[PDB]
Design a protein around this ligand. Sequence first.
Ligand SMILES: *[C@@H]1O[C@H](CO)[C@@H](O[C@@H]2O[C@H](CO)[C@@H](O)[C@H](O)[C@H]2NC(C)=O)[C@H](O)[C@H]1NC(C)=O
Ligand SMILES: *[C@@H]1O[C@H](CO)[C@@H](O[C@@H]2O[C@H](CO)[C@@H](O)[C@H](O)[C@H]2NC(C)=O)[C@H](O)[C@H]1NC(C)=O
Ligand SMILES: *[C@@H]1O[C@H](CO)[C@@H](O[C@@H]2O[C@H](CO)[C@@H](O)[C@H](O)[C@H]2NC(C)=O)[C@H](O)[C@H]1NC(C)=O
Ligand SMILES: *[C@@H]1O[C@H](CO)[C@@H](O[C@@H]2O[C@H](CO)[C@@H](O)[C@H](O)[C@H]2NC(C)=O)[C@H](O)[C@H]1NC(C)=O
Ligand SMILES: *[C@@H]1O[C@H](CO)[C@@H](O)[C@H](O)[C@H]1NC(C)=O
Ligand SMILES: *[C@@H]1O[C@H](CO)[C@@H](O)[C@H](O)[C@H]1NC(C)=O
Ligand SMILES: [Ca+2]
Ligand SMILES: [Ca+2]
Lengths: 641, 641, 87
Amino acid sequence: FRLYWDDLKRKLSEKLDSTDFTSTIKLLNENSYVPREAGSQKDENLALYVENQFREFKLSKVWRDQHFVKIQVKDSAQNSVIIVDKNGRLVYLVENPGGYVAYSKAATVTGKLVHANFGTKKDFEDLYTPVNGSIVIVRAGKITFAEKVANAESLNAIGVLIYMDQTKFPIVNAELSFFGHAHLGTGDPYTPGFPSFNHTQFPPSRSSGLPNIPVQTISRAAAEKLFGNMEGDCPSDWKTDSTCRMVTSESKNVKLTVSNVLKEIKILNIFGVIKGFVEPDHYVVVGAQRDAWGPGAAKSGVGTALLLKLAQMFSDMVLKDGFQPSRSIIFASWSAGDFGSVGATEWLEGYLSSLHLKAFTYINLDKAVLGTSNFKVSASPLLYTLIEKTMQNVKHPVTGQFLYQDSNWASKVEKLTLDNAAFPFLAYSGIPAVSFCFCEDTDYPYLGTTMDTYKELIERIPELNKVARAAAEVAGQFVIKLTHDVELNLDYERYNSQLLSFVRDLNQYRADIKEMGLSLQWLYSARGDFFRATSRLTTDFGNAEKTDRFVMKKLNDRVMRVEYHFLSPYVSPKESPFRHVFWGSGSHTLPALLENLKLRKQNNGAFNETLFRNQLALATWTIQGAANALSGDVWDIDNEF
Amino acid sequence: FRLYWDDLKRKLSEKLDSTDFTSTIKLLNENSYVPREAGSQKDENLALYVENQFREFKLSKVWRDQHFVKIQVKDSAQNSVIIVDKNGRLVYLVENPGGYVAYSKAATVTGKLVHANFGTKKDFEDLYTPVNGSIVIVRAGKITFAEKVANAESLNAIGVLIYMDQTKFPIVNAELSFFGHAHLGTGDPYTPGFPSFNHTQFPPSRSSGLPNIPVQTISRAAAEKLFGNMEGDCPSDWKTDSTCRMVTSESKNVKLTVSNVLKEIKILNIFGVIKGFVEPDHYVVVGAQRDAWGPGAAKSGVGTALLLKLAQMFSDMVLKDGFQPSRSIIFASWSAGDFGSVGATEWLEGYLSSLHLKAFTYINLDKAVLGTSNFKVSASPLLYTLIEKTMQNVKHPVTGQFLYQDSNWASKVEKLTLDNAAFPFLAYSGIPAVSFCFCEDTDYPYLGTTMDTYKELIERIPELNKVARAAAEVAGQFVIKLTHDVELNLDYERYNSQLLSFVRDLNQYRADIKEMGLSLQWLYSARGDFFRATSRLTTDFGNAEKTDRFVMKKLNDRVMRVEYHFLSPYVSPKESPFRHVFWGSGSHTLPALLENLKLRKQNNGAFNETLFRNQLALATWTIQGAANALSGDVWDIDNEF
Amino acid sequence: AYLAPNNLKPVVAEFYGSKEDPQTFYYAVAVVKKDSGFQMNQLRGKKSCHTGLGRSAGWNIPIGLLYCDLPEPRKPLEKAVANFFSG
Ligand SMILES: *[C@@H]1O[C@H](CO)[C@@H](O[C@@H]2O[C@H](CO)[C@@H](O)[C@H](O)[C@H]2NC(C)=O)[C@H](O)[C@H]1NC(C)=O
Ligand SMILES: *[C@@H]1O[C@H](CO)[C@@H](O[C@@H]2O[C@H](CO)[C@@H](O)[C@H](O)[C@H]2NC(C)=O)[C@H](O)[C@H]1NC(C)=O
Ligand SMILES: *[C@@H]1O[C@H](CO)[C@@H](O[C@@H]2O[C@H](CO)[C@@H](O)[C@H](O)[C@H]2NC(C)=O)[C@H](O)[C@H]1NC(C)=O
Ligand SMILES: *[C@@H]1O[C@H](CO)[C@@H](O[C@@H]2O[C@H](CO)[C@@H](O)[C@H](O)[C@H]2NC(C)=O)[C@H](O)[C@H]1NC(C)=O
Ligand SMILES: *[C@@H]1O[C@H](CO)[C@@H](O)[C@H](O)[C@H]1NC(C)=O
Ligand SMILES: *[C@@H]1O[C@H](CO)[C@@H](O)[C@H](O)[C@H]1NC(C)=O
Ligand SMILES: [Ca+2]
Ligand SMILES: [Ca+2]
């Protein structure tokens, strides 16, 4: 027979009202798995358990992939933060922090302490007190740890202490510690660009992101002792508590000591695959982080629960029920996502020549269930219409409403931040990536913490089974909607609104661009060329038969590589890996061009005019070249005559 | 009544028995087209003639392309050379040279003079006197001009003079002066890596290969007057005239002045296509160079004449006869092919997105006819088996026997030289290429001079028509063999001998690789994995149906990227463009690794150990990466265990 | 017929009226049996005979009038029409 869509979402709900996620999240929180740093023994026992499950669910092929990396772990000596008097006589200590920061430096220093809000660059340039030569304190949240340490390194400070206030993070236990990686960029930093297998023989190298300054996480109650000695008031624009103070008194000054040692540990990745029936070699990757520093049920528990239950569900629907996919599906559990996601980045840098142009969507199940109120998504624009249709099918878990309440949601979507694990798929490799969370308005309090566990998780969310049912239902709609049909549901219309947003952002500086002696018109015509390419492609889907396969493969290959052609071909992938000109990092991306252009008006001398000429030429020709490559053969490009 | 290979070969020979090349070489040498500098008016009339002919042969789409390039022409002040003493008061004028080197820096300098045999990198150690602080002379031939200026510039010289002796280049006229470009690399230099279109705003950028020293060409009697004052004697290894001498007298001195100005000119490329019936978007490119500094009868007339006649035969044979090619064919006429062939390189860097995996062969019809004694081919190794069969089916024009006379010719073949127009395609874009000449034992003497005219070419080669007929037959054999059948004739197993030759070359330095503390054996295993890759792919071509199209498209997409995966993905295309790990320039290719290990046995202190270990890691993982990309999918590896 | 990979085109049309006043369109009608007493609205579950799948007067206009009166799943159309018309 055949199974169409409306039959098939019904079959998913009938498979989905039977499964139980709560028992599995208890299972990943037992005493045989509960502390699992990367490379530890409990990680390898969990990887044997998952790699047993992918065999028991009758997957088509299950395989393991291991490689050796360098992480940083605590030393046998303690690291402390300790108040030093001006006399040098009586020495008072505040905390021996249980939690540490990855990729910091082994050092020990003294000096003045200066409060900063979050370590935004705006904060450091809004400060009154000069920053240099002085240890700083910041509050965790709103930015990755590595960009706090990056800004505090650019302003020539020595030390960084990071804590959690009560206003942003309301908790009861003031004596609590946590964890974070400090590497700007991702991947294993001691092998950038090339993968960390055992064929490279590990040449000497180092990344660019690693700071040269000691970083340390302190608790709230440690921050109250330091704020007992400081003076000068926090300004009222900081939505903060009543205790924080700006700089130290002139007598006392703190002493930070941080002592961490490198380690070289073995990383396992477990995979299992479901084959396709029309085109088996094109596939779609579904992932989840397998470990976390503390007990870790919010970070890696719910991801591995959703992953195991989804692998059971689709293997059962293909084997027993009669569902027939057209493309393969890869389910994946990698470890070491907590050190800036090296388990995924070392895989992408491993096999990049084989999943060139083959893998067409990555899905992230990680951090799915945190809050119960809202629904937040972050994705490549190619997937937006897809998510829109899914928000018109799935019901809310708490109330009976649908998710599609706000009909204007494409602007509220924020781009993928670097601490997300779907970022090296989109920005480095060129795969359209999607992540989502049921998240409360304030972020989840104990998320990288020793108190992250199932007890306090079920205290926050009183109905976890229904919400996990909803999130697995949404990922089910994404996989089935991407795989059952001959037409991909990647919507290439969506980059056009991004381009209109960019050139519209450049029209307000046409007055400064006209003073340099160079015009802007070729970039308008580049936007227009991308419009006519997408419109021509839509009409060519209009005239194609649907049952025919040879005339739909030639139109699907043009859809698959509209994401690859926005990667810049004019940069080196070792010197800067994230090459997506929209959503990247460096001097080549398009908001880097805007952020170069607005500094000309202030007339400091920080603008670099030759750099702006090269950035305009390379951005204009990258967008124009994607617009050539989306529309037709070579001879059907119309030239300027 | 379908057409198979036998009917189509005799149909092509029935076409070649009729056409008359000699009238068209006499027609591209008429007084209305004869001096063809790049961008000058006399190029334009030929360009409209070639576009007009391509419309007249009923090609399926004829289209053209124009963009603006910086060349460097002679100023109104005459550059010259002169002999002075230490004061400058002694003045004896040698000559005023007609010819000039493009891209030589504009400066005036004095100095003593040192000889070198060609400016090979081996020569300056074998030379007796120190080179620095002094002008050099070199003798024209055996390497490009840019490698002479790059070597003598690399050893701190000041100026380079270039002459043609009587032994290597036997010419009666002792007055003749000549031309050559000095850019190390290819293309328009002032836009490195991005196209010269006026979409790109023309940003200030300067290529890293341009020289810093004044370079000049002198005639033969102009060289002997310098050999009168210089005192010494050449070694007897240098087969030369009796009158060469090494260095100047001690009271004597040589000053040369060079004045050349930049000009901005307009470049045309003229194209036509023949559509394909099975797969239209895959195409094979056939090119030619349209302009040359002298009259240009051997350098541009023969290539363009062969191109126009192949357009006549293939469009005639598709329209009237009933041939049905399964893939498209692009005919191309590049201009400014003489300043490093900037037409082709700006064409690739313009349309690299649209050519990604589409084009899969270039054929270079340039300088096809130079003599009548040998047959010298130079190609990327996927074409070697093809050339095998073609050399068994083309009779030599003088003696009636075939061209495949030596059964071992794959080792005699030299790699593609940088002045050849196929080298930006193969080295830069990863497209298989081929060039071929009927070269004499000694090279064609007056190639880039003002003496290159027609009647000298018919006096040197007495039967131009049969030789041009043989080269047109070889090109017709290639084009039909690639575009008649369901199977591509790109033989992929020929890379196995190349990898075996590399590892067998490193296996002598295994004794020092064991001293550094790293083993070689992973690279042995990488060669092994590429062998089992091409074996498994030959099995998959075994077990498939030939009539079916959907499976042979899936295999031909896997063969068509066996060349793209040898482009190294760790270096910037704008900085070092020729990214091909075998056949290209830089510090990343395999000869640079063999060299950078070979330096260590000298124990000079010049080798760079970190750069070595880094090079070995990247080259090993590149070869293993192509081996993974051939054999199947992500799950059929056959990884570590 | 004009969809890729067919790529076709009408070359000769035909006219239906008298010769002196040529007519190039044809009306579409729905024939019933007398005294059955069901309207266009109360047509549910009655048997019907078509002239073909995809022809103009047979499939596209009669189903084209009433396809939005059917309940979802809308596509594939022959399934929901198969559950609208009994037999
Ligand atoms: C892959 O590389 C790792 C890293 O060196 C090797 O693992 C080490 O092997 C040495 C000697 O056998 C021992 O110190 C340990 O077994 C490993 N060290 C650590 C820190 O784990 C491994 O042997 C390599 N694999 C192969 C096949 O050679
Ligand atoms: C501004 O851009 C210019 C671009 O030329 C930079 O200048 C040179 O850039 C090249 C990059 O290829 C470097 O190798 C040189 O060392 C740079 N020279 C100097 C003097 O900096 C320049 O660095 C950029 N930044 C500023 C602040 O001027
Ligand atoms: C694109 O670029 C070319 C070259 O920079 C421009 O041509 C020049 O135009 C100016 C102004 O009319 C002339 O003074 C120059 O002589 C032209 N160059 C040459 C080589 O003739 C051209 O105008 C630009 N714009 C367009 C639309 O083609
Ligand atoms: C040998 O290779 C090393 C590694 O590249 C070179 O050392 C540095 O290379 C970086 C580029 O990554 C450049 O900043 C400089 O060339 C070097 N930086 C230093 C020394 O601080 C080194 O130059 C190479 N050559 C020699 C002779 O050692
Ligand atoms: C850097 O810090 C020192 C601390 O002693 C201070 O005196 C100095 O003014 C600071 N530098 C600048 C440029 O303000
Ligand atoms: C460069 O030339 C000067 C004089 O011409 C000489 O003294 C010096 O030794 C030369 N350099 C080297 C490395 O020999
Ligand atoms: Ca790596
Ligand atoms: Ca260029």
